[PDB]
Design a protein around this motif. Structure first.
Motif, PDB file in Angstrom:
ATOM      1  N   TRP A 274       0.803  -1.225   0.000  1.00 39.52           N
ATOM      2  CA  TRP A 274       0.000   0.000   0.000  1.00 39.52           C
ATOM      3  C   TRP A 274       0.831   1.269   0.000  1.00 39.52           C
ATOM      4  O   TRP A 274       0.321   2.321  -0.369  1.00 39.52           O
ATOM      5  CB  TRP A 274      -0.932   0.048   1.214  1.00 39.52           C
ATOM      6  CG  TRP A 274      -1.759  -1.159   1.372  1.00 39.52           C
ATOM      7  CD1 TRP A 274      -2.246  -1.952   0.378  1.00 39.52           C
ATOM      8  CD2 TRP A 274      -2.220  -1.719   2.594  1.00 39.52           C
ATOM      9  NE1 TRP A 274      -2.976  -2.985   0.908  1.00 39.52           N
ATOM     10  CE2 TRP A 274      -2.972  -2.870   2.268  1.00 39.52           C
ATOM     11  CE3 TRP A 274      -2.057  -1.375   3.933  1.00 39.52           C
ATOM     12  CZ2 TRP A 274      -3.569  -3.664   3.225  1.00 39.52           C
ATOM     13  CZ3 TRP A 274      -2.638  -2.172   4.889  1.00 39.52           C
ATOM     14  CH2 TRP A 274      -3.390  -3.303   4.534  1.00 39.52           C
ATOM     15  N   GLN A 275       2.094   1.165   0.411  1.00 43.64           N
ATOM     16  CA  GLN A 275       2.935   2.316   0.713  1.00 43.64           C
ATOM     17  C   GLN A 275       2.240   3.109   1.785  1.00 43.64           C
ATOM     18  O   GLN A 275       2.026   4.321   1.658  1.00 43.64           O
ATOM     19  CB  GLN A 275       3.188   3.187  -0.513  1.00 43.64           C
ATOM     20  CG  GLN A 275       3.907   2.457  -1.635  1.00 43.64           C
ATOM     21  CD  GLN A 275       4.509   3.397  -2.673  1.00 43.64           C
ATOM     22  OE1 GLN A 275       3.894   4.401  -3.073  1.00 43.64           O
ATOM     23  NE2 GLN A 275       5.723   3.071  -3.115  1.00 43.64           N
ATOM     24  N   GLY A 276       1.872   2.391   2.837  1.00 42.46           N
ATOM     25  CA  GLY A 276       1.083   2.935   3.913  1.00 42.46           C
ATOM     26  C   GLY A 276       1.689   4.149   4.595  1.00 42.46           C
ATOM     27  O   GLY A 276       2.868   4.139   4.992  1.00 42.46           O
ATOM     28  N   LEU A 277       0.851   5.165   4.767  1.00 40.39           N
ATOM     29  CA  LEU A 277       1.241   6.401   5.389  1.00 40.39           C
ATOM     30  C   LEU A 277       0.973   6.398   6.896  1.00 40.39           C
ATOM     31  O   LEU A 277      -0.123   6.700   7.339  1.00 40.39           O
ATOM     32  CB  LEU A 277       0.459   7.516   4.720  1.00 40.39           C
ATOM     33  CG  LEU A 277       0.627   8.940   5.213  1.00 40.39           C
ATOM     34  CD1 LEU A 277       2.086   9.305   5.421  1.00 40.39           C
ATOM     35  CD2 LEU A 277      -0.038   9.860   4.192  1.00 40.39           C
ATOM     36  N   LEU A 278       1.988   6.099   7.696  1.00 39.19           N
ATOM     37  CA  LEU A 278       1.781   5.979   9.122  1.00 39.19           C
ATOM     38  C   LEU A 278       2.059   7.314   9.840  1.00 39.19           C
ATOM     39  O   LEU A 278       2.723   8.196   9.286  1.00 39.19           O
ATOM     40  CB  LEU A 278       2.630   4.842   9.641  1.00 39.19           C
ATOM     41  CG  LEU A 278       2.308   3.537   8.902  1.00 39.19           C
ATOM     42  CD1 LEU A 278       3.334   2.474   9.252  1.00 39.19           C
ATOM     43  CD2 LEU A 278       0.895   3.045   9.216  1.00 39.19           C
ATOM     44  N   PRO A 279       1.481   7.511  11.039  1.00 41.53           N
ATOM     45  CA  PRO A 279       1.740   8.772  11.734  1.00 41.53           C
ATOM     46  C   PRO A 279       3.161   8.808  12.320  1.00 41.53           C
ATOM     47  O   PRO A 279       3.654   7.792  12.808  1.00 41.53           O
ATOM     48  CB  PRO A 279       0.670   8.818  12.833  1.00 41.53           C
ATOM     49  CG  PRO A 279       0.160   7.436  12.965  1.00 41.53           C
ATOM     50  CD  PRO A 279       0.420   6.719  11.681  1.00 41.53           C
TER      51      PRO A 279
END
Length: 341
Positions: free
Chosen positions: A205-210
């Motif tokens: 996903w190319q996850g955008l984490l905080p």
């Protein structure tokens, strides 16, 4: 505003569901309210070729916008009727359907995963239509299951977008309903370890984490896909609703349909771990009932703990966060008089 929510599209046409079809939202503008409820739809997710293929064969509508009706009716907290929604029936209502299969965290452009991008675009689109146009407005970002995680992963980003970049005079709050999962020993071994799927998801996903959470797990940021790890670094107020015997946690724990006492006892312990994992949470409503999701249901007015209904607890939390722990006090499945059906 008894009328249905109305489909709308996004300006930036590069923001897409999994299959390439365009994304968007449903809107029901209220003629005078400054309060907004933005509800993120849920489901599960897909993290590799096999699971995504299978989701496309078994759940196409959650990966594409083609089957979407022009209008949607949603109950619970997006209902316009005061009997069903006694405190939020007269707000502006937005529904964002879930067609990104990425727990609303994807930024990747055989599929696209734009969850986090979709959410930031919808919020951008609400500004010209009145969101925080007048000082003293309020945004409640709410979601169920993957929608719950969607809220927790983006809540701080969205507050900081609106209060800082955009300099709006608005109070921003989040609610996660049934999106608080645990990584624990399953009942029987499953093909893939919980943690390996989350890792693949993050990368696919190319996850955008905080960032504040990413800092506390710098070896392995994918840890921030768990509610209980995200939460201690979260700055914006978050209300957590959790069925202590949640059905989705049971599927994850690979328990099967419970017909044996060993399965039922594993479920009993699964509730105790859930309960404990909520030790830190300042605002929480967690009844000992079997269930999955609540915010969109007409029944949401009926579930009580110590005779405090969910809407009523949520309203109190709103009051006291304008600038609250209810866990069931018995511990077994269905000990609450008011459990659903």
């Amino acid at each position: 505003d008894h009328r249905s929510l109305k489909r709308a599209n996004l300006a930036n046409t590069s923001i897409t569901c999994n299959d390439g079809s365009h994304a968007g939202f449903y809107l029901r503008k209220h003629p005078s309210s400054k309060k907004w409820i933005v509800l993120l739809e849920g489901g599960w997710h897909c993290f590799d070729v096999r699971s995504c293929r299978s989701r496309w064969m078994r759940l196409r509508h959650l990966m594409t916008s083609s089957q979407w009706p022009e209008t949607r009716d949603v109950g619970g907290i997006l209902s316009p009727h005061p009997e069903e929604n006694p405190y939020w029936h007269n707000a502006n209502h937005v529904l964002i359907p879930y067609c990104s299969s990425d727990s609303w965290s994807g930024t990747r452009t055989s599929w696209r995963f734009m969850g986090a991008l979709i959410l930031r675009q919808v919020i951008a689109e609400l500004i010209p239509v009145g969101l925080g146009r007048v000082p003293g407005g309020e945004l409640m970002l709410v979601g169920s299951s993957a929608g719950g995680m969607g809220v927790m992963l983006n809540l701080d980003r969205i507050r900081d977008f609106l209060v800082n970049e955009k300099k709006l005079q608005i109070t921003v709050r989040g609610v996660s309903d049934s999106g608080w999962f645990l990584d624990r020993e399953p009942y029987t071994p499953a093909a893939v370890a919980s943690n390996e799927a989350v890792r693949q998801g993050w990368k696919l996903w190319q996850g955008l984490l905080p960032e504040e959470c990413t800092k506390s797990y710098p070896t392995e940021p994918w840890r921030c896909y768990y509610g209980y790890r995200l939460y201690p670094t979260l700055k914006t107020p978050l209300f957590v609703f959790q069925w202590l015997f949640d059905e989705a946690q049971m599927r994850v724990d690979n328990v099967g349909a419970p017909v044996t006492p060993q399965q039922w006892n594993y479920i009993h312990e699964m509730g105790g771990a859930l309960r404990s994992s909520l030790d830190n949470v300042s605002a929480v409503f967690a009844p000992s009932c079997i269930g999955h999701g609540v915010l969109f249901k007409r029944d949401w007015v009926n579930i009580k703990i110590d005779d405090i209904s969910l809407p009523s607890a949520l309203r109190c939390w709103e009051h006291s966060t304008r600038s609250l722990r209810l866990l069931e006090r018995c511990s077994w499945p269905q000990c609450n008089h008011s459990c659903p059906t």
